Amino acid sequence: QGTILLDLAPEDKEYQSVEEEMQSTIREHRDGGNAGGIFNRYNVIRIQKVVNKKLRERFCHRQKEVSEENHNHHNERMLFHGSPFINAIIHKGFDERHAYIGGMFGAGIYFAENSSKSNQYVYGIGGGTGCPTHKDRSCYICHRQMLFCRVTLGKSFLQFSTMKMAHAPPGHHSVIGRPSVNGLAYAEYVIYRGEQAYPEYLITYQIMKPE
Numbered sequence: 001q002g003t004i005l006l007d008l009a010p011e012d013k014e015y016q017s018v019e020e021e022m023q024s025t026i027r028e029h030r031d032g033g034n035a036g037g038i039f040n041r042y043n044v045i046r047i048q049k050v051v052n053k054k055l056r057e058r059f060c061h062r063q064k065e066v067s068e069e070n071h072n073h074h075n076e077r078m079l080f081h082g083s084p085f086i087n088a089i090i091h092k093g094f095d096e097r098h099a100y101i102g103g104m105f106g107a108g109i110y111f112a113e114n115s116s117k118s119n120q121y122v123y124g125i126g127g128g129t130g131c132p133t134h135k136d137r138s139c140y141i142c143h144r145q146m147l148f149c150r151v152t153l154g155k156s157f158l159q160f161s162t163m164k165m166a167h168a169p170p171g172h173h174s175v176i177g178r179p180s181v182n183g184l185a186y187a188e189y190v191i192y193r194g195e196q197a198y199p200e201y202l203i204t205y206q207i208m209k210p211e
């Protein structure tokens with residue numbers, strides 16, 4: 001078999017937990033919404049738990065390698081990811097060959113702890129041309145998708161400034177861009193190996209027009 005998508009009932013704590021994590025990390029972006037659209041609340045249409053035997057094996061297999069190199073601590077973490085490649089990701093997993101080379105920290109796979117940051121990328125860099133059907137970045141109609149993943153960070157190379165890497169720095173397994181006055185408002189997590197992230201949950205949703 002391949003990937004199985006398990007519907008989480010909205011009355012379930014698991015579903016409830018994901019949503020609150022998603023709804024609760026919304027924030028104002030210095031962009032003004034141009035990228036991800038104006039809203040301060042989402043409408044969750046549904047959340048499905050991605051199940052894939054092979055994807056799990058590679059992630060887990062990679063998980064203990066990082067542990068070997070990080071004092072038996074893989075330092076896992078739940079983070080959001082958004083891009084126009086979600087449907088491929090939940091079937092084939094994260095593949096760094098499709099990593100974003102224009103990234104702040106190099107050709108890696110980017111995650112955020114603020115659902116609103118990943119939302120800016122759902123339709124492409126800087127929001128691209130908005131939704132496929134209406135070509136609107138702030139569309140309140142079309143259904144969007146972002147992931148809430150398990151991310152194996154291992155030993156993270158902490159950095160403030162832009163520095164494009166192809167791979168994690170020696171002895172490290174990830175890069176954490178930290179907030180800087182003339183820099184990042186908020187932190188972003190980067191990995192250079194796809195199998196160090198599992199696309200746990202697939203959230204289908206809509207941003208909501210203000211009140």
Ligand SMILES: O=C(CCc1nc2ccccc2c(=O)[nH]1)Nc1ccc(-c2nnc(-c3ccccc3)o2)cc1
Binds near residue numbers: 119
């Ligand atoms: O990470 C990015 C850039 C967009 C992005 N940037 C951020 C920057 C700071 C904080 C959070 C984010 C973020 O959520 N997304 N894009 C991206 C695009 C595709 C991938 C990908 N991984 N596997 C595939 C794949 C696999 C099989 C077939 C086709 C594609 O694509 C990974 C990352």
Ligand SMILES: [Zn+2]
Binds near residue numbers: 131133136139140141
């Ligand atoms: Zn639309």
